[model samples]
Target: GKIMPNTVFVGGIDVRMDETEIRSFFARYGSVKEVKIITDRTGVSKGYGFVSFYNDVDVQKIVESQINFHGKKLKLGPAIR
Candidate 1:
């Protein structure tokens, strides 16, 4: 069977958290493929982001490791879309 990758939904993140900085967190698990941070119409951050990993193991490792950002814990899970 062909394996499928998963994107982690990061919640409770800092508005200032950018792609590079957020990518570093998932990079610990494996090479990060992409990162996305949601923003409002005004360009303000919505305090959430998404990280896509080529390997599910990367997602697995992050799930096992409890990492927090800026004193706030990240809520990781399969992306809605």
Candidate 2:
């Protein structure tokens, strides 16, 4: 498995979406190793999340086509870590 580049990042996502849906949606482009959504003290989604892929090619595809889910535009890319 190849490690993804740390510089990639995604922005502009809909806050209402849940992790399962997010994971399922992103899996279409690649194999999702992990999915995480940042939340506040109240455990509310912070309008963004991170998706890890097992392969680099899938990650690139996800970055290119992970927008507009359920009438909301999504931002997809590599994890900062």
Candidate 3:
């Protein structure tokens, strides 16, 4: 089976957070191919987002590291796209 590159599902994010802030956290892993903090009809973030990496290795690096995320303690897992 050909597994997809590590696209992560990040939850428990601060609703007030924005793309720039999210990028700040994940950029440490590697180039963040894409990021989207899910929003609602009112344009309020849903406290979750997705971040895609260049490859599985970069994603593994992130998964292997400690991500306290300013006490947000983000919940992360392999995202299926």
Candidate 4:
């Protein structure tokens, strides 16, 4: 499967992290298209998320650098189909 260029799968987030926090953190790298924090049925964070950018370059920019959120080193990679 080919990786989607404008969206990334993010892991290693703090369980308490929220979509807003994810958005703000990633916005430093580029314009954020959307932020989706995967949550359990109870609406608690699953410690992972997805972040889409307006440009593919933003995705590349993030994956190439080191990032941390809420004391956890984030795992960033192109979203695969």
Candidate 3, lDDT over the whole model: 0.75
What does candidate 1's lDDT look like per residue over 15-81, in tens digits? Answer: 6678888988678766678888888999788988788877665565556576554546777765654
Off by over 4 Å in 2: 1-10, 58-71
Candidates sorted on lDDT, descending: 4, 3, 1, 2
Compared with the true structure, the alpha-carbon lDDT of candidate 1 equals 0.72
lDDT, model 4: 0.80
Which residue pairs collide, candidate 4? none
Model 4 per-residue lDDT tens digits across residues 1-81? 998878989988886677888889878767899898888999887888889889655576667776555555788877888
Q: List candidate 3 stretches off by more than 4 Å.
A: 1-4, 55-61, 64-71
What are the TM-scores, per candidate, against the unseen true structure?
0.72, 0.63, 0.72, 0.76
Candidate 2 TM-score, C-alpha based: 0.63
lDDT of 2 by residue, 13-77 (tens): 56666778877876765777777777789987677767766765445655666556553556666
Tell me the lDDT of model 1 at 42. 93
CA displacement after TM-score superposition, residue 33 of candidate 2 (Å): 0.8
Better of 1 and 2 by TM-score: 1
Better of 1 and 2 by lDDT: 1
Winning model by TM-score: 4
